[PDB]
Amino acid sequence: ELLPYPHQLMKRLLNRISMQSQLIENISMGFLDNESKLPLLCMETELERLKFVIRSYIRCR
Amino acid sequence: MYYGISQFSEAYNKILRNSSSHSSCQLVIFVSCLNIDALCATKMLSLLFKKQLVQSQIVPIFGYSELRRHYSQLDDNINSLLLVGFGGVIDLEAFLEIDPQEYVIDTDSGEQSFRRDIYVLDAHRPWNLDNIFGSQIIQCFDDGTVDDTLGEQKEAYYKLLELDRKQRKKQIHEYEGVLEEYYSQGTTVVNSISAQIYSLLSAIGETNLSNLWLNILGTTSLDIAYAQVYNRLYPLLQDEVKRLTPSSRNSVKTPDTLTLNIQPDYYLFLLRHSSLYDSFYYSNYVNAKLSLWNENGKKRLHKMFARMGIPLSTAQETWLYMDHSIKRELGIIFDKNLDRYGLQDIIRDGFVRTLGYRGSISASEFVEALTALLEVGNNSAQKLTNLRKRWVSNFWLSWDALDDRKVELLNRGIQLAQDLQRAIFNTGVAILEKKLIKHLRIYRLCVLQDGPDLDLYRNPLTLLRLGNWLIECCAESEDKQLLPMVLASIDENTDTYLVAGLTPRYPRGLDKKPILNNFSMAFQQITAETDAKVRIDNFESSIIEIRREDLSPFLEKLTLSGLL
Amino acid sequence: NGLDTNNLSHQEQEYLKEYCDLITDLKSGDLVDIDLSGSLVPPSDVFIDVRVLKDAGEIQTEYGVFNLIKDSQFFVRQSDVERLIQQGYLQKI
Amino acid sequence: KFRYMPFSPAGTPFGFTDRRYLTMNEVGYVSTVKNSEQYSITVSFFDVGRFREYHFEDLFGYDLCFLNEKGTLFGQSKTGQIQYRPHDSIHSNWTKIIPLQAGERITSVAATPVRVIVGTSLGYFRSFNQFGVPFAVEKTSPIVALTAQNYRVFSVHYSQFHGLSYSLSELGTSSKRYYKRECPLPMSLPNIKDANLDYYNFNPMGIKSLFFSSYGDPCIFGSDNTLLLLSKWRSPEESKWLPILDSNMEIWKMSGGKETTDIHVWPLALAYDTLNCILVKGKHIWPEFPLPLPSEMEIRMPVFVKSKLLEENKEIQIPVSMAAEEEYLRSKVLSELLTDTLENDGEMYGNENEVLAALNGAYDKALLRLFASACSDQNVEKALSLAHELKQDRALTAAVKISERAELPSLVKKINNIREARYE
Amino acid sequence: NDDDNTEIIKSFKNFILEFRLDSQFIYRDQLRNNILVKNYSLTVNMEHLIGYNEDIYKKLSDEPSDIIPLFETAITQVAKRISILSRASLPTFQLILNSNANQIPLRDLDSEHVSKIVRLSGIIISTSVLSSRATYLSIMCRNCRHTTSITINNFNVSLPRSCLSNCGPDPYIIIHESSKFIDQQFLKLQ
Amino acid sequence: SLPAHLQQTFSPEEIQFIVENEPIKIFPRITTRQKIRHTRWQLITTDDKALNNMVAMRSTEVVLWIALLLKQQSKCSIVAPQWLTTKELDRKIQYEKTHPDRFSELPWNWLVLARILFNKAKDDFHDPIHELRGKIQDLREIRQIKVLKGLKYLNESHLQLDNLSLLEINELRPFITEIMDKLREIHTASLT
Ligand SMILES: [Zn+2]
């Protein structure tokens, strides 16, 4: 079956992806314009993994 | 001077401060292909920058023309270069048309700083003094040579730079004398680039058995041509093998156990992959001692195995399947016999690596496999460019062969090494049978005009294999004076000879001060006088390519020159 | 195409055009923060080695450049080069 | 007969091999390799963000070492050579020979952000500042073992004519203080099997290691494989050694009994309540060069009657009375150590008061679970004596509820008097 | 003798169960994959046997006609251990050898190669029908019906000369119902 | 829009991705807990606290993809879960041999996590890794025998597979579901 869409959950997830991307942007600007890259790497590959789950889910349905 | 052996750490810290970020790729590594030591140094360097997560690019480069091409198309975003295995012997600041006032930033203070570093990792000597002292951007990693030796040349350089009357004239004449005695030295390699990078890893604390094996490999590649340097560096490699070797003893051979040993690694050609017979037969040293290029030498080799009690069929077995009792006993058999034949320098302790159950490989065998991959792994100017592209592409086969995940590619390297050395040997016996060598008063000349395998010798490394085979054969004779040699081979497609100017060397077992390759500047001087259309853009500047019609005028002027 | 034409009927050609227009309409609307046309193999590594398989000169990316020199090799964020792996210019992993 | 030997914390012998550890602790570990006639020394660190590993060839053959945050200190016991190596290398290395009489040896060395300390088999105790300037020479009972953490120095003394004793100091940039000087130490020595004899030839005191907690309490781990911690050391008239972890007992327990042997505990650091240690397996007592991951043992107050556990278990399950006894005692001693730390030194992270509050919760919970058993046997006096121990009035309500559900109105009445007294 | 045979068998069992390259147990996997499709054999690369423990290859190459049956026996035991639950039947597995040793041309093979492992090449000129050879004979005495059995390995066998405790001069006969047989084919190589 | 091979199952890489979301115990080799006397992790898929409060060799629990990302560098060591040790795997092997019908209660991620940690954390095991690989192999072989015995009892109705791994299930899924589907289709076709 095509299962019912989690409307509210997906709204919240897309909001978090947008805000987390804007955060990673802001910190990258702060680096370009203490300076440990490792948490930024974890943030970046987190958003890649999370966006993969949403991509696989939507493409499936 | 620029970065001494004690302070490579400061240079590496500077590389990270300037040219590391999650954001952008900022570091470019130029590496001279057709150089095993530069390859291994770049591999160690790339593993370091992998672990430290520095976004970086490697470009393999054939020669100075390709350097000046690729350098001209680097963006201002690229604020560090590492030049691996070239560039020390030439004024890079002039050659790349650098102006420090075009690269300066944030000078404020009696002080300067620059938008691009150019670090030089080169073992060739003499250093160009404009790199060492003249430039504020070129940054050479030094083995100690500058501080050990070049104090007088340092003094002369700085005073002649300052010295813009009779005393003034005598002083500038004096320091011109010093610098023109320092220049016009012959070229020579004094260190292994890979051990230089290993000293950097030691300073950072990054040493491990992978990086130690790469250091061993890049260092072992010097052993054919630069045996004195290898003998300098071998004890330090022993120290590091003992320091990193694990503590278990009588260890059971297990699929996961990488064990890196010091043990007997004889001076035989690919012993553990050749047959025993072939490993004697195709060895440069064995051919030199036994004069194996003729039937009487072949008879002597048969005599040797007969006196060893080894059946010739057993000697010709592939080494894995060769008789286990003979392999256990082989050190004793060699000890009991090889002094009678003068081959006692076959005995050597070298580095052997084995990884689980897939069998042992020595550093000797491994560098032979890597060179074989560099040599043969995969309108005239366009054809030449396509050829040099093929050699650039061979670099990544040797690179990938350094990884245990791709040992089938290493096995390709082993096979190609055997067949290459067969071609070397056949061309060599052709030269010595037909006496192609001409004994000119100042140097020995050999020119390959025709025959099989001629399309291999357009590769510089394969030509240097034949050169080293011949030179080992010459060195072990007391009859011959130790003259320098020129070795050339025609490319019938480009209509150009590839020509190599080769040092002599003393016989392998004897010990004296090194003797330097003065073909580099001699070829430059003839090139400067002549109308001939010779190319001198190869990084090993004692190797050139020259149009066929120009060769005889060129060699006539060479032998009339007093520079050799 | 959402990132041999003779073999299609004209209805199929204009159908393929309209369907690509639809895919682009999705990844251009809401849900845009996910490249919906991207890969479906999970991201295993954030930094990868990539060998330049065909030459393409100097190109910028978000905060830098790549000069796609033939048979050069990078160590680089996968997300900054994925498009070129799909387009066949970069080799490894 | 007894013999003096060089000590360093958690260092190991050579044994049959050609390499050993000079020391290991919360900062890192140091190993030496008998590289023919000279020694290859490697200094390795556990925080690889702060500190970078380094190595050097040693021509003197150092056999003493001490490693802390600011630098490494080395010593050669027989010749008196010592060397100090700051880790940043901004401050210089320095080397010195300290004088030894015939047959005298350096027995231990230690370092501090403003001092370097050397003790010898004849009891001389030589102090240098961190740049090698000689500052003092004392004579004491021979310092067989020695360490420091920040400015706090803790040393163990022994001779045939003085017995086993310890000293504790806090030297500092100012207000140089001594807490206890050569007080007797309650640690157990070995019997002054052959692998044990090899180790005790290397280390006759049997002190496997000696260190400070993360909160700065002195600790020592003897031949009985029992961790001792000196509690309330800042007020010397109240100080007492706590045997906070019998590691033989806990090894026997976690292995499911069976008289389990050929598994040994090699301690590195206590942290807060959790001994970091290598668990060595086989005949030898000490680790090999590929240093295993330092497994973690939580401290266990030694109240575990082995016969009772053997009867109930014949994987081991603990009766709730024993478990609550250990819980009550462990939580009490840990809360006391945290309280003294926070009063005298204060918080170093930003959560120690929260940890102390959570721990008090566990303490009152353990008291309630023992109170329940006392009420089950209807022992009003035992239950009441337990009721006095609870710290939170809010938890003392549970004593009321239990005594109600145990149908003990006498307990309810008396506890209500305590409720009122605690409110007032 | 059978103590040493047991040790040889255990050594081969360990070779099957332990030999590993790049995270894969190639001989365990090959043995299982062969069992599923019901071919009861194992193809062994002697490079791997040499690399594992060259003493084993020394035993094998010294006298393969005694050591190959023990290797086959080891393969049977591992086959059962990896395909039949221990304490809730298969034939004797054939050992097939892959090798890269130096070839001997057919005309050079002579008395020095008798009982040695040999590698060669040629053209097959003929192939005979599938004759039947015994792997296991059920046996009994013609007079007293003493019953026994003879396991056979085909590397160079007979019936016993007289009864294993009068039974007459040549007393044993085969029982074909409980005996076991295999296909044997002759090839002529030129 | 979904590839043919992903239509009704997970790729082994997707199974790895699922398993990578599990927490795992690590020994840090960096300190991030700041003293009272700079960038923080700021995650959104998992808990941020442990990474922000690491201290070297104070063991702590983090999500496995982060633990691997740290262990790609020298900055971490991954503590093996208790089941992934020689004695525990031997106990599970004895359970498997002792109970022919049941599968032993290894955790659902066991093959995947064994693969991951043997490749990316080969130096963190207290036990010799060659024995752990051998016993993981013993377990997979025995469990595969039990799988083959189970497939003799496929039905039109249902099936029960108590302690089968996620990877073992995913390996069998495009066979068992197809055969039980076709048995259902045969059966339901017969009904009046
Ligand atoms: Zn009979």
Q: Which residue from B255, B100, B262, B89 is spatially nearest to B187, judged by alpha carbons?
A: B89
Q: Left if phi > 0, otherwise alpha if psi is -120 to 50, otherwise beta: which for C49?
A: beta
Cα separation, E26 vs E24, in Å, equals 5
DSSP state of B245: S
**Residue carrying the six token digits 């005495």:** E141
Contact A55 C42 (CB under 8 A): no
Q: Contact C33/A21 with Cβ under 8 angstroms?
A: yes
Per DSSP (E only), the strands in B433-495 are 438-439, 444-448, 485-491
Contacts of B53 in chain F (CB under 8 A): 73
Element (H, E) at D62: none
User: Angle at the Cα of B120 (from B117 to B124), degrees rounded to 5?
Assistant: 165
From residue B165, give the alpha-carbon distance in Å to each of B169, B171, B253, B323, D132.
6, 10, 78, 82, 55
Return the number of CB contacts < 8 Å for B and E. Answer: 39
CA atoms of B232 and E186, how far apart (whole Å): 64
H or E segment and range at residue B414: helix B407-434
Under DSSP, the state recorded for B405 is G
Centre of ligand 1 to C-alpha E180, Å, is 23
CA distances from D392 to D358, D389, E131 (A): 12, 9, 93
Contacts of C73 in chain B (CB under 8 A): 57-58, 396
B368-400 b/e (C-beta count within 10 Å ≥ 16 → b):
bbbbbbbbbbeeeeeebeebbeebbebbbbbbb
| Torsion from C-alpha of D381, D382, D383, D384, nearest 10 degrees | 50
DSSP string for residues in chain E: -HHHHHHHHHHHHHHHHH--BTTB-HHHHHHHHHHHTT--EEEEEHHHHHHH-HHHHHHHHH-HHHHHHHHHHHHHHHHHHHHS-TT----PPEEEEE--PPP--TTT--GGGTTS-------EEEE---EEEEEEEEEEETTT--EEEEE--TT-----SS------SS-EEEEEEEEEEEEE--EEE-
Distance in angstroms (rounded) separating the CA atoms of residues B85 and B31: 6
Q: What distance in angstroms lies between residue E175's CA and the mean position of ligand 1's atoms?
A: 15
Instruction: State how beta strands D64-67 and D71-75 pair.
Output: antiparallel
CB F174 within 8 A of CB F9: yes
* DSSP, res B133: I
For the residues of D256-310, what is the DSSP string, one character each?
A: TSTT--SEEEEEEE-TTTEEEEEEEESS-SS--SS-----EEE-B-S---HHHHH
| Residue D389: Cβ within 10 Å count | 16
Tokens of B410: 């290493």
In 3D, which of F146, F119, F147 has the Cα closest to residue F133? F119
Burial class (CB in 10 A: 0-12, 13-18, 19+), B120: buried
Whether residue D54 and residue B242 make contact (CB cut-off 8 A), yes or no, is no
In this structure, are residues F41 and D355 in contact, taking their beta carbons and an 8 Å threshold?
no
Convert D356-386 to b/e letters by CB count within 10 Å (16 or more is b).
beebbebbbbbbbbbbbbbbeeeebeebbeb
| Distance from the B289 Cα atom to the nearest Cα atom in chain E, whole angstroms | 28
For chain A, say whether B17 makes contact (Cβ under 8 Å): no
Beta carbons within 10 angstroms of residue F191's beta carbon: 5
SS (HEC) of C20-72: HHHHHHHHHCCCCCCCCCCCCCCCCCCEEEEEECCCCEEEEECCEEEEECCCC
As a whole number of angstroms, the distance between CA B422 and CA B526 comes to 35
| Numbered residues of chain A with Cβ closer than 8 Å to any chain F Cβ | 16, 20, 23, 27, 34-36, 38-43, 45-46, 49-50, 52, 56, 59-60
How far is CA B465 from each of CA B188, B425, B487, B536, rounded to the nearest angstrom? Answer: 18, 10, 11, 20
Chain B contact for C75 (CB, 8 A cutoff): yes
Closest CA to D244 of D263, D217, D208: D217
Name the residue with tokens 């044997």: E184
Written as six digits, the tokens of E146 are 């003493």
8 A C-beta contact, residue D126 and residue D111: no
F11 contacts in chain C (CB < 8 Å) = 41
Chain D, nearest residue to B205 by Cα: D53
What b-and-e string marks burial along B207-243, b requiring 16 or more CB atoms within 10 Å of the CB?
Answer: bebbbbbbbbbbbbbbbbbbbbbbebbbebbebbbbb
Q: What is the resolution of this structure in A?
A: 3.2
* Other Cβ atoms closer than 10 A to E189: 11
Residue B489, helix vs strand vs coil: strand
Q: Are strands B56-61 and B80-84 parallel, antiparallel or unpaired?
A: unpaired
Q: Which of C31, C46, C77 is the closest to A58 by Cβ?
A: C31
Q: Identify the helix (H) or strand (E) that includes residue D352.
A: helix D352-376
Per-residue CA distances from B263 to B260, B346, B350, E53 (Å): 10, 13, 6, 19
Residue D350, amino acid: G
User: CB atoms < 10 A from the CB of D234, how many?
Assistant: 18
The residue whose two tokens read 């297990």 is: B254
Confirm or reject contact between B208 and chain A (CB < 8 A): no
Cβ–Cβ gap F16/C42 under 8 Å: yes
Q: Tell me, what DSSP letter sits at residue B134?
A: I
How far apart are the C-alpha atoms of E72 and B175, rounded to whole Å? 83
Please report the DSSP string for B385-397 in residue order: HHHHHHHHHHHHH
* Residues whose CB is less than 8 angstroms from the CB of residue E96 and which lie 6 or more positions away in sequence, other chains included: E41, E42, E43, E44
Q: Using an 8 Å Cβ cutoff, are F54 and F28 in contact?
A: yes
Nearest CA-CA partner of B54 in B23, B76, B10? B23
Length reported for chain C: 93
The secondary structure of residue B185, as a DSSP letter, is: P
In angstroms, rounded to a whole number, what is the distance separating the alpha carbons of residues F183 and F152? Answer: 13
Structural domain count of chain F: 1
Q: How determined?
A: cryo-EM
User: Residues with Cβ < 8 Å from D208, sequence gap 6 or more?
Assistant: D10, D221, D222, D223, D225, D266, D267
For residues B184 and D37, is the Cβ–Cβ distance under 8 A? no
Measured from the Cβ of residue B21, the count of other Cβ atoms closer than 10 Å reads 20
Which of chain B's residues have a Cβ under 8 Å away from the Cβ of C63?
21, 23-24
**What SS3 class is residue B139?**
strand
Q: Residue D10: which region, alpha, beta or left (left: phi > 0; alpha: psi -120 to 50)?
A: left
Hey, is B6 helix, strand or coil? helix
> What does the alpha-carbon distance between residue D144 and residue D158 come to, in Å, rounded to a whole number?
6
Dihedral, E84, E89, E94, E95 alpha carbons, nearest 10:
30
Q: How far apart are CA A30 and CA E171, in angstroms?
A: 101
- Cα separation, D1 vs B87, in Å, equals 68
Tell which residue, B543, B525, B545, B523, has the closest CA to residue B533.
B545
Quick one: CA dihedral B292, B296, B302, B307, positive or negative?
A: negative
What tokens were used for B62? 């054939």
Contact A44 B53 (CB under 8 A): no
First to last CA, chain C: 22
d(CA E125, CA D44): 70
Distances (CA, A) of F108 to D99, D347, F22, F93, F167: 66, 42, 11, 16, 8
Cα(B367)–Cα(B226) distance, integer angstroms: 15
**C-alpha to C-alpha distance for B241 and B216, rounded to whole angstroms:** 10
* Residue A19 forms contact with C (CB below 8 Å): no
Chains A and E make contact, 3+ CB pairs within 8 Å: no
| Residues of chain B contacting A41 with CB distance shorter than 8 Å | 22, 53
Q: Is B51 on the interface with F (CB under 8 A)?
A: yes
Question: Nearest Cβ partner of E88 from F100, F119, F137?
Answer: F100
Q: Is C75 in a helix, a strand, or coil?
A: strand
Where does chain F break, by residue before each gap (C–N > 2.5 Å)?
37
D390: Cα within 13 Å, side-chain hemisphere: 26
Residue D137, H or E segment: strand D134-139
Q: Residue E162 C-alpha to ligand 1 middle, in angstroms?
A: 8
Could you tell me how many CB contacts below 8 A there are between chain B and chain D?
A: 32
- Count other Cβ atoms within 10 Å, centred on residue D413: 11
DSSP D64-79: EEEE-SSEEEEE-TTT
Could you tell me which chains touch chain F, where touching means 3 or more CB pairs under 8 A?
A: A, B, C, D, E
Q: What is the 3-state secondary structure (H, E, C) of chain F?
A: CCCHHHCCCCCHHHHHHHHHCCEEEEEECCCCCCCCCCCCCCCCCCCCHHHHCCCCCCCEEEEHHHHHHHHCCCCEEECCCCCCCHHHHHHHHHHHHHCCCCCCCCCCCHHHHHHHHHHHCCCCCCCCHHHHHHHHHHHHHHHHHHHHHHHHHCCCCCCCCCCCCHHHHHHHHHHHHHHHHHHHHHHHHHCC
D32 sits in which H/E element: strand D28-35
Indicate the residue of D16, D42, D52 with minimum beta-carbon distance to B243: D42
Q: C44 contacts in F (CB within 8 Å)?
A: 13, 16
Q: Which residues of B touch A28 (CB under 8 A)?
A: 22-23
Is D197 in contact with D204 (CB distance < 8 Å)?
Answer: no
Please, which chains are in contact with A (at least 3 CB pairs closer than 8 A)?
A: B, C, F
User: Cα dist. C15→C10, C22, C23, C37, D238 in Å?
Assistant: 8, 10, 12, 18, 90
What is the C-alpha separation between B295 and F77, in angstroms, rounded?
A: 63
Q: C41–F16: do the CB atoms touch at under 8 Å?
A: no
Three-state SS at D96: strand
DSSP state of B562: S
Which residues, 6+ apart, have CB-to-CB distance to D114 below 8 Å? D129, D130, D151, D171, D172, D173
Residue contact A52–F17, C-beta within 8 A: yes
**Structure-token pair, residue B171:** 């002083």
CA distance B371 to B414: 10
Give the whole-angstrom CA distance, residue B264 versus residue B281.
19
Distance CA D21, CA D68 (A): 15
Ligand 1 centroid, distance to E2 Cα (angstroms): 27
Contact across the interface for D293 and F74, Cβ inside 8 Å = no
Q: Is residue E168 left, alpha or beta, with left meaning phi > 0 and alpha meaning psi from -120 to 50?
A: left
Return d(Cα D383, Cα F73) in angstroms, integer.
Answer: 56
Q: How far apart are CA B479 and CA B334, in angstroms?
A: 27
B495: alpha, beta or left? (left if phi > 0; alpha if psi -120 to 50): left
Amino acid symbol at B156: A
Angstrom distance (rounded) from CA B39 to CA B57: 14
Query: Do the Cβ atoms of E18 and F137 come closer than 8 Å?
Result: no
The enclosing H or E element of B181 equals helix B166-182
Contacts of D419 (CB under 8 A, 6+ apart): D393, D396, D397, D400
Rg value, chain D, Cα:
24
Residues on chain C touching F64 (C-beta within 8 angstroms):
none
Is residue B370 within 8 A of residue B406, CB to CB? The reply is no
The sheet that has D19-24: what strands, in order across it? Answer: D19-24, D28-35, D38-45, D54-58
Quick one: how many helices (H) and strands (E) in chain A? 2, 0
Residue type for position B24: S
Neighbours of E81 (CB within 10 A): 17
List the single residue in E20, E83, E87 with the smallest CB-CB distance to F145: E83
Cα(E81)–Cα(E98) distance, integer angstroms: 24
Q: How far apart are CA A7 and CA E87, in angstroms?
A: 54
- Neighbouring chains of C at 3+ CB pairs under 8 Å are A, B, F
Question: Distance between CA atoms of D134 and D137, rounded to whole angstroms?
Answer: 8
| Residue B534 dihedral angles phi and psi, to the nearest 5° | -90, 145
Q: Which of residues 79-108 of F touch E (CB under 8 A)?
A: 97-98, 100
- Residue type, position A45, single letter: T
Q: Report the alpha-carbon distance of residue B129 to residue B120 in Å, rounded.
A: 13
**Beta carbons of F41 and F52 less than 8 angstroms apart:** yes
Domain residue limits at F37: 2-191
Residue linked to tokens 């096979």: B415
Q: Letter for the amino acid at B45?
A: L
Contact D329, D303 (CB under 8 A): yes
Determine how β-strand F23-28 pairs with β-strand F60-63.
antiparallel
Chain E CB within 8 Å of residue F142 CB: yes
> In angstroms, what separates the C-alpha of F65 from chain C's closest C-alpha?
9
What DSSP string runs through B259-326? EEEEEE--SSTTTTTSBHHHHHHT-HHHHHHHTTTSHHHHHHHHHHHHHTT--HHHHTSBTTTS-HHH
- Please give the Cα distance from F180 to F153 (Å, whole number): 10
For C75, the domain range is 40-93
Cβ–Cβ gap C40/F13 under 8 Å: no
Distances (CA, A) of F118 to B244, B508, D60, D288: 22, 47, 41, 21
Asked if B53 is an interface residue toward chain A (Cβ–Cβ < 8 A), one would say yes
Residues on chain D touching B203 (C-beta within 8 angstroms): 54
Q: Is F69–C46 a contact, with Cβ atoms under 8 angstroms apart?
A: yes
Q: How many Cβ atoms from other residues are within 10 Å of residue D342's Cβ?
A: 16
Is residue F54 a contact partner of residue F70, using CB atoms and an 8 Å limit? no
Report chain A residues whose CB lies below 8 A from the CB of F62. Answer: none
Closest by CA to D13, choosing from D291, D288, D290, is D288
Q: Which tokens sit at E61?
A: 């190459």
